[PDB]
Design a protein around this ligand. Structure first.
Ligand SMILES: Nc1ncnc2[nH]cnc12
Ligand SMILES: Nc1ncnc2[nH]cnc12
Ligand SMILES: Nc1ncnc2[nH]cnc12
Ligand SMILES: Nc1ncnc2[nH]cnc12
Ligand SMILES: Nc1ncnc2[nH]cnc12
Ligand SMILES: Nc1ncnc2[nH]cnc12
Lengths: 231, 231, 231, 231, 231, 231
């Protein structure tokens, strides 16, 4: 693997995928034990540790379909990763997505061309692994963590003069981020299991920025849900 | 409503949507009491009855995005229908998909241009109402009905020399049908709840067909699950 | 054939194709003799009878490219049908299309993706069989039935928020319907002969709905023209 | 008119449109009396004369959609030309298309993006003026000139490694040329009457070429038919 | 070669490509010696002569991607031409392109479908031969001829209701013409060397037409630069 | 600037843009004096120092169009950066491309949809600032550093089953990377100067890899050339 400098067995079967390598660090150091950093290439830190005994990895993906695709492919093809769970944030684009909501994406729209490259005239609809999603949902409900299940939009252009998010909101899409289409497509293509869990970093359409206290409570809830999404 | 010859009231808040108006007839007569036909326009029959103190309607949609779009639109816009649940068949495209599996579609791919017409360069991924999906799942588990949750492909062309079934199957898609993309897109667009439940009518790739005994059994399973999808 | 429950030789070489299976019934019972219903699958009635001795069939197609494609393919591949003539209605989109005009389509624009699925970057222009069209034209002129020859638009979305009919009208397109692209494409692909004859059910752009007396006179004229379109 | 150096009046209401300005010269000198050259801009010659008390013009168009679009636009917009009739050659792509057949194009497919640029997700099918087509047909029958009526393909690329000639031929398309789509689109757009009449210059697939004797004969046939297309 | 009536060795290794065959004449007669016309087909004159001893050809291309593609392909495939240099004009679309500027195109945007025909979802960016461009630049600078190096837009529709030139200007595109994409694509595809040199015939966006004195001085400068662009 | 944690002033007018923030670190520490880190957000390090009385900055971009677009946008919009110069690696796709060649990109192709999203039916060709390209060329020649000038391909997918590398190579494209299209598009759009300088990290087709010795040598060459691109 060209972008991960790790050996056999150093990466667990289950990998959390924050976008930010500094969040991978924070997650590993805060939630796991027996932490080893297995990757330093390009500063895209990957870590491996244990949670209640179980080997878990946490790997930064960087931003956008192309960056996450690199890491997901190597993780899957060279380290045989079976469960891939994005933990990151999105801009909410609907009023009924609350700042405290943990979002589970069932599927993801995109303006990436990756699927049209593969399918031409077909619209490929990526799809979360249902078992992972059902576990994550039940984990939230059992504790009373508020959870919303729906779809997201995977954007190529964080800054997009030709954005269609008002239309997307109207069709029921919950928020915008920059990875999920890739995660879900590449995972299912190789018989692996994918899910994205998201918290709300802002409300793109109305203006309202969240507060530090909100984001950090929900981030905690997200990770806790994640740590229970594999049975 | 150009294609439904019914007056408001006559159609329930929850509508089952088989492709075949003769299946709509079957479902109503077999599962409901106090059954009335509210539509004969174009032979596309619809019926209303009760199932245990709940008014339910059953409406033939015809085959294909354009045909289902017509009925769904008019049900939504003219009759204020809130829950819309496709009950139909698909051609299975994966071996791991069994002839007894009731399929619950989370999303669907398509070669229909309906969404590119609306979104251009965006791949829009339609999305089941999770609430309906989860109830249908829990109902199937309660009875021990086997169930598979994943994605389907909505085809414009039952006979397609340029089909990409093999690529879709390699990407995890469970089966082929002709309605789901439109159902989920139109329902979400108007804040309504949609779910597709499908039985296996054949295995597309292996050619292997499914007996009558298996079909009727799974059909029964699908309807009974469907009648349990609204909370 | 999965959607037509008929045996060998039960379907004639020449088939009329109304969209509405109840119009197939009306046509068969009103214009033909020795009528047998050969199909009841999905309520999509097909009939076979004689007109001045000659075996003629009439088969409902349902609405939209996908539905008609199913029936045209089975009719052609399993029953060896040689002449396929759509008889239905359209919404007129030009002022000079009069309520009494029988429209013969030379070709058809579309927002269906079926041809882009097959041809990619090519715009496939479907084309009527000229011999059938010339016969239908001469039949109308010999009696003095008013006839207009031009093109139509084959729409996927009867309800389309992104319709381009004002632009299409300007380019000379006569009306909107939901079948012709399919009929013409599939027919010529298999060396068979296709034509669509259309009457005006309304004027989409200006508002004016026709009258029952108009539609029924012109419908009669359409069928009469059809019954003379095969030499 | 940037590319036609003529003053209003000088160009007839009916214009023949060969690709080759030297053919335009030939046609004028051979078939018309009182012949004047009205344009030398860019060597793209045009001529006006009379044929039996009717003023007719003959204008070279050059090769390809962009070139013909230039001349057609300026003829329509600057000189109020009402009838525009391409007389040219095509590469035959079906065996059933004979070296002696005069081809009358009802419509044309294309890999030109000219219509997608205007219509996006709509496949626009251009359409001959039926009145002209029918007169040309009746004129050919009167003389016993063999004639084929159907569709052609308008190519941007005479030499195309990515050609789809075989698929087009299987779909009934008669031959390849480089003008028709633009002629018919632009003429219909401005309420003008267009027709393309084509001779066979070669058989594209079988490689088999057409003698001079056959070419000149069919050419004669095409011009004589053309001079009979306006009522 | 179907469109060039020339024998072996009659065409030089270096060919200038004006759009206008009458400019090919003017160029050959004005700048070269020992001039022979090798082509008269379709009036698209090609000439061959000497400049300070060196064999140079000048060949009219006609207008648009399809026309120039024909000539470039034949020149390359049948006459083994190695250096192809377009000399023509463009409409300037940016204020800082002055009437006296000789434009050298590094690359070219287009609304032609030729590259999408070949590459589908890929945007192919055509590219000038750097050696030819560097020579042409140095030739201009050594004499003090003002030169601007950037990109152009290769248009299919000289008359385009759907033009995007305001957007293109904003992205830095210098001017509009109708050939360069073709020249550059076809050349590099066959390992040959391409460049387009352009003068400003007008300012498309602001209105200002140049003067005859301007155009003719700059045209001279263009040809002089061209005659030094091959080492 | 959501992703750069710097205050105005801190970032130079000229910025080098490696993909790897650890390369950004290397470049700064090795080539500049008085080095300060101005950004640690997301581990995407940036640095400013001086090289011979000139303030220069070095900013990691991450991998892929979406990631570089983020940093480039914020550098342009929030820090008024005028010169932006990618220094990175590519997979060579032509044998004539040597392991020692420093590549200067004139333009780039892409399978990113970023430009179709903005332009629809137009293929937008991005363009290096010639002034920067020419200085980089002249600097390389001065030292005798081998250099190749041509086009690259910007890929969304490092691992792409549907790659068209062979076709691109046949069309003259020099190598594959993941940034250039966005750099050149965004820089030109805001009147800024962009150039990409690339070293060969591998030969994509022949599989043949490049030693450390060769890599470090060419890397040195690239940086030294880069530091000479602003006049
Ligand atoms: N525009 C945007 N795109 C992607 N992720 C985001 N998070 C917040 N705003 C975003
Ligand atoms: N094999 C098949 N192909 C397409 N649509 C279908 N619906 C059911 N079976 C199908
Ligand atoms: N919008 C429409 N689409 C198709 N057929 C029609 N007939 C009348 N209106 C129509
Ligand atoms: N073979 C051919 N290919 C493309 N255009 C043509 N025009 C005439 N013959 C042709
Ligand atoms: N619109 C245009 N297209 C191409 N070349 C041109 N030269 C001047 N105006 C032009
Ligand atoms: N082989 C390759 N494919 C894609 N992007 C690359 N960047 C560097 N090498 C590459």
């Amino acid at each position: 693997s060209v972008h991960i400098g790790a050996e056999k067995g150093q990466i667990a079967d289950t990998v959390l995928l924050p976008g930010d390598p500094l969040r991978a660090k924070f997650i590993a150091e805060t939630y796991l034990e027996n932490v080893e950093c297995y990757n330093e290439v390009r500063g895209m830190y990957g870590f491996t540790g244990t949670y209640k005994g179980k080997k878990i990895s946490v790997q930064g993906t960087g931003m956008g379909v192309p960056s996450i695709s690199i890491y997901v492919n190597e993780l899957i093809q060279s380290y045989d990763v079976q469960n891939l769970i994005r933990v990151g944030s999105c801009g909410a684009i609907r009023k009924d997505v609350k700042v405290r909501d943990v979002i589970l994406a069932m599927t993801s729209s995109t303006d990436s061309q990756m699927n049209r490259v593969a399918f031409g005239s077909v619209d490929f609809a990526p799809c979360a692994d249902f078992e992972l999603l059902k576990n994550a949902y039940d984990a939230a409900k059992d504790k009373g963590v508020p959870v919303t299940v729906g779809s997201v939009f995977t954007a190529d252009q964080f800054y997009n003069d030709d954005s269609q998010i008002e239309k997307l909101a109207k069709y029921g899409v919950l928020g915008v981020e920059m990875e999920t289409t890739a995660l879900y497509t590449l995972a299912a293509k190789h018989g692996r299991k994918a899910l994205s869990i998201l918290t709300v970093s802002d409300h793109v359409l109305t203006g309202e920025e969240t507060t530090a206290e909100e984001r950090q409570t929900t981030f905690h809830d997200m990770i806790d849900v994640a740590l229970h999404s594999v049975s």
